[PDB]
Each structure stands twice: as C-alpha cells, then as structure tokens.
C-alpha cells in the first residue's frame, strides 16, 4: 500500500491510518556483473516517535562466518529466567549477585 | 455447590509470539537429535526457523 503527499495534508484530525515502513535489513546484494544505476530513490516520510518497540530478537541469520550481521539483536536475560515464589505469595527474581 | 471458576487442561497466556520468514534462506545441513531431545525442545525450533 502506498499513500500520497497531498493526502497527508488533508487527512481528518481523528482518523488514524496505517503507513508501513520497510525493514530490509537482510537482503542479498547484486552480483559483480550487472547493469548500473542512474540517480535513484528519494524517500519523503520519516517517523520520529520512534517506532521500534516490540522485538525479542531480530534477523536470526549468520553473517559469514562466526559473527553477527550489523544491527542484529538477541533475546534479553529476563525472558530466560524462571525465579522462585515469594516468602509468601508471588513471583520473585533470581536474585542478582 | 456454587462453582465460581471452571478448570482447564493447559493455560493460554496473554502475550504470544509472531514471525515473518524469508523463504530464501535455507541451510544445507539437515541436523538431527534423539526423540526426547526433540520433544522438550521441538516446537520452539519451528517458531525460529
């Protein structure tokens, strides 16, 4: 889905539309022998919230060879820790140190 | 009896997982393990293909 720069100036105050953002972190680069390019893509919109919110990990592919690809995250040391019950009634952590 | 709450076999949970695969990134090494090595750590492997 693609929107226009004229509709972004006439949209009603309380009507929330969705506009998708392209990731494209893992994408194989072109081969050595292929036609070149001439003055390409111009991007017009940018989020400043910022949007990156819910991600356990991202791009689980290995970059050649034993290293992480640039800008890849792993799961946090919190969703991998089963604690113990309280001295009475609810869940507590490890704890630390 | 009054029976306020009903019982269930397995719990659900409020927070679940989602994924977006890339159907062109396949490793050429078909690994293998035992059956009890499979069961405990099984469906979690097929959520992080």
């Amino acid at each position: 889905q693609h929107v226009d720069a004229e509709s972004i100036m006439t949209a009603p105050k309380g009507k929330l539309f969705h506009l998708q953002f392209m990731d494209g972190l893992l994408r194989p680069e072109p081969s050595a022998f292929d036609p070149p390019a001439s003055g390409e893509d111009m991007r017009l919109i940018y989020p400043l919230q910022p949007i990156s919110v819910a991600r356990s990990m991202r791009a689980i592919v290995n970059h050649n060879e034993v290293d992480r690809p640039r800008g890849a995250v792993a799961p946090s040391s919190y969703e991998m820790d089963t604690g113990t019950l309280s001295r009475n009634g609810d869940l507590l952590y490890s704890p630390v140190a | 009896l009054s029976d306020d709450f009903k019982q269930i076999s397995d719990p659900k949970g409020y927070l679940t997982y989602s994924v977006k695969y890339e159907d062109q990134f396949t490793k050429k090494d078909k690994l293998r393990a035992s059956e009890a090595d499979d069961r405990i750590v099984g469906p979690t492997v097929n959520l992080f293909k």
Binding site: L26, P28, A59, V61, N62, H63, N64, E65, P69 | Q24, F25, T26, K27, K28
Partner: peptide, 27 residues
C-alpha cells in the same frame, strides 16, 4: 545350507555433477 560356498564384493562409487541451487546461504 547344503554346500559351503564363497562370494565376492567390491565397494561401489557414486557421484553426480554438482547440481544448481537457487537458495542463498549467508547475509
């Protein structure tokens, strides 16, 4: 079962030309 015999074998060799794959490996 009746008469004791003798057989022979030779380890086989199997190879095909390197096939083409369309799937990529690393980033």
């Amino acid at each position: 079962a009746k008469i004791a015999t003798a057989s022979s074998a030779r380890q086989t060799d199997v190879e095909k030309p390197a096939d083409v794959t369309f799937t990529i490996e690393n980033v």
